[PDB]
Design a protein around this ligand. Sequence first.
Ligand SMILES: Cc1ncc(COP(=O)(O)O)c(CN)c1O
Ligand SMILES: Cc1ncc(COP(=O)(O)O)c(CN)c1O
Lengths: 424, 424
Amino acid sequence: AMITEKSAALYARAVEVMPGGNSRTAVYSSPYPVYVRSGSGARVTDVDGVERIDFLNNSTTLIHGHAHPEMVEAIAAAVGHGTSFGMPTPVEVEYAEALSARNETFEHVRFTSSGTEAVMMAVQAARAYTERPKIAKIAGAYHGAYDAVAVNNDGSGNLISHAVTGNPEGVVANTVVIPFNDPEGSLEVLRRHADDLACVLIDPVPWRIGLLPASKEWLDALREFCDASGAVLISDEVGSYRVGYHGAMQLLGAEADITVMGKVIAAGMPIGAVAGRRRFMSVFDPSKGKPALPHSGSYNANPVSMSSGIASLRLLTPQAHERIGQLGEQARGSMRTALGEAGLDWEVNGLGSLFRVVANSAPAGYDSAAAAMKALYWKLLENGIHIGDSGLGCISTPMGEEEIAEYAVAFAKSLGQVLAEGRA
Amino acid sequence: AMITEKSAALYARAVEVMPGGNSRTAVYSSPYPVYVRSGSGARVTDVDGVERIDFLNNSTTLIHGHAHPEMVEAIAAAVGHGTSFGMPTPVEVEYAEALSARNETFEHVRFTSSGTEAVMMAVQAARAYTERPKIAKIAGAYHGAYDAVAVNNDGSGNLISHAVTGNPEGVVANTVVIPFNDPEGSLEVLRRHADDLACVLIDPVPWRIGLLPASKEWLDALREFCDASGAVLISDEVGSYRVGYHGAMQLLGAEADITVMGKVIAAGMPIGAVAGRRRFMSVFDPSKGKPALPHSGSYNANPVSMSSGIASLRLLTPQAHERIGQLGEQARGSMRTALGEAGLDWEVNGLGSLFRVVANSAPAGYDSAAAAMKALYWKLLENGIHIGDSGLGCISTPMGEEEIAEYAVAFAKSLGQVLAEGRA
Ligand SMILES: Cc1ncc(COP(=O)(O)O)c(CN)c1O
Ligand SMILES: Cc1ncc(COP(=O)(O)O)c(CN)c1O
């Protein structure tokens, strides 16, 4: 049924000018991905003219969906006045005030052009503040391509160092890994390295290891360890911030020293942020002599990304946050009903407006649970829905109960087709 | 004479929500920087309502100046269709075709959200391709905040390792440094490390060590060393690309394996690119199983930055490139005349549309040549001109003979005022 000839023709062009026709690993699918030309509200139109409901929203960036009129007005007005300057602007100050106001711990903020850069600068800040070399991160959790965090970042629960091809021992030896939600297992590792630990980098709701939240007991163990050792507690909320109105740590009853943000804070334009207590952020301050940690960047605090940010935070009201959490609960419940009626043991995890289908047992005719989840991703595309090819999804503010009901009908139909094709 | 009350008031707000009221080290000035609200063509209007001619153009990013109508149209129209997607778009293919066409060695390209990220991914690509740990870079050259390149990066010619506070030995020991334009001094270092060198990272026209071009002899020595050792030759042209129509290495008679680009290639929207021969770029290819080097990023190849890129490259015609080169030659000549008439030993370096005033001997009443250059930066601001506080500047395509003549008058007046204040 599905016509993808214009996607295939773009892919044939792309392979001549990009490696494997790709510029972003996460958006590649075999034999080629679907190419898209426009979005409006909750819906994306592909290059073959097919409109689908988007349930992943640029990897959970687009909390307000596609081309929200209030976002478009603010961004286009900023573009007209100049895209970037070699001087600070009023909107950087306005946006830092707006972001600082979201959480007590966001005393001072610094803007980058991505979450990948913001994670990197939060780790550099902790190393400059402590003058210690090691970082600790969660086994399996993903934090972007920066080489200190591109270690054990693939969903595995093993603690043995495993890094990207070429990441030197010089980097990999200074990143230690802790088991998620295992307080005693975590403290064993952290106590072994306490004298040398600059930071403990967590994600309170890491999607790559199943989108389960950090427990109170595990957050308490790490917060007490950081207070005792002097290690900086960094919460990477680039993806998970959206689960709470004041971010993920606040929802779970905890406080970070530094929080990394991105994605929803600007809801589509390039952004990252490092926010935390004044003392940890003081490594960046250039006002009293050379800073401990220089941090430049051509697009830092550019007024287009600041204007996108002001508009996003204005639209992300407590009422919007509540209503998308209602829709997330409706979506997760409809998926669990559909998986149980189909006779699969797969789980659906998530908080607020985030979810992830976590494939467990591979059904007949699939080599792995991940292959069965890729097949479900393709069947959902045929049935008018975009989700992540390993089960991630989210709600956008343009959605109502009708979109989630349409998704539930597509989800049940798709499961049926995946299972029937595996048995053929 | 100069009124900065609205800038002071923004700074007073900024210090409460950013470290030292700053989000980008390079745009800070004591006691506070000038804040700006808008740009049009070659001119910037500050928050106190004062219009000046911009001769630095967001650190040489804005090759087409501020809010170029054709740039504004392309960007604002792209925004209306969707700022970013979790799927590739037609404009990524169109822009990769446009950029690949600029140099024979740009066979395969990948997009990032910054030059800092692009440098990082080019170093990771060479380490993945060779499976060797070390990189070599130029003593003094700046490549952004990534910790492997944030070593010997502040204008010094010393080869002794000097890194940011907290950069661990595990990083710093794998970055070796070579003296710019010294073939035998460079080959001594590179031969000592040849078995362990993944790459030689250069900038062919590094502004931080005085904006002098790489010699034919030095580029030939490095190209031959890389061919012999299997090290990847990386040219970081994030700033220097603009000196030639086919980039900096081509102008100077050389070929890189990988070229890093940014800034002018999108002329004001967040961008970076890694462009090189197919074999080096193959580490990123996801089309034949898992790639050696995963490379994602929420804003990679976003259609707003791609649309900015297509418009910028379309506007950067051979005719435009020649005209800004002529204006740069006229500007450099007018500065050298003014410095000679004022009795300073200062030099003016640069190629094409780039220049740098290189302060040598401190005149009476200044502790250092750099303090004297900072004073000239402030006097130029008073006389209606923005340049860099250490002498960097550039020409933009909106400029004509009238802007370059106005600059020459302001430059001579400002030098007189700097010298008179130092002697007073
Ligand atoms: C937890 C986390 N941290 C950082 C990043 C990287 O952010 P960006 O895509 O803005 O570079 C991501 C992206 N998946 C993320 O999930
Ligand atoms: C040579 C060079 N490389 C890379 C960068 C970083 O690029 P961006 O500002 O886009 O991160 C810079 C910026 N100063 C640079 O000058």
